[PDB]
Design a protein around this ligand. Structure first.
Ligand SMILES: [Mg+2]
Lengths: 140, 125
């Protein structure tokens, strides 16, 4: 499993990489929106922790692109600069969850797993609609 | 087009009835939980303006219900007791939007037009 962290707080970002690695997750981080767009345009990540407020671009912008491009990618927005409006917009754009700083590690872990579960059911169901609709539905 | 208003405040509830009428809409209030639970078990409203904290029930629950029952009725939770977790939750359950009090009427209205528009590009799809 791949998790792209996109925080710029040298410490928090570091702790995550460090923590999540024990779990057994290939992690790759990024300071700014660019290091992110580079990495998200080379490799494919399942999950993405997304700091809302970055120096060069606004979180959502990235969110949008990620979804609009690789929807099979579950994005968890984590921010210390959030608002109900801003969180609702995040959700509306297709973001599994929206965590608020401070946020315990263990939870970030949980939310990542749930994020994976979801990204998966949606798969299975998408497979059935093919099994159904197609297969045993073709005049069969 | 219908509009089920689930506010427990005479002032906002009323104010909401009197406004949504001038537009040209069948609006119907609801003081508490069951009141609304019944009218939804009786008729079908396009849009529902659920309020989060009611006396008896916890609005979300109603939102839950409205979706598992008739998942075509769009809900717009407008409240004054909102928290990002709640809103993030409400969203993850069905809510089209999650508006905060105070909220100008125009914005509430408009957030209903945009609710149906989105409640349409699905019938087509
Ligand atoms: Mg920052």
């Amino acid at each position: 499993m791949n998790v792209l962290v996109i925080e710029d707080d040298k410490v928090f970002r570091g702790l995550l990489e460090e923590y999540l690695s024990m779990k057994g997750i290939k992690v790759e981080s990024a300071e700014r929106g660019k290091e992110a767009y580079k990495l998200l345009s080379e490799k494919h990540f399942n999950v993405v922790l997304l700091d809302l407020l970055l120096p060069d671009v606004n979180g959502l912008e990235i969110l949008k692109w990620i979804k609009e491009r690789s929807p099979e990618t579950e994005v968890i927005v984590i921010t210390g600069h959030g608002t109900i409006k801003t969180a609702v917009e995040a959700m509306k754009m297709g973001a599994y969850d929206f965590l608020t700083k401070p946020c315990m590690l263990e939870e970030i872990e949980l939310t990542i797993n749930k994020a994976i579960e979801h990204r998966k059911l949606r798969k299975e169901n998408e497979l059935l609609r093919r099994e159904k609709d197609l297969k045993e539905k073709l005049a069969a």
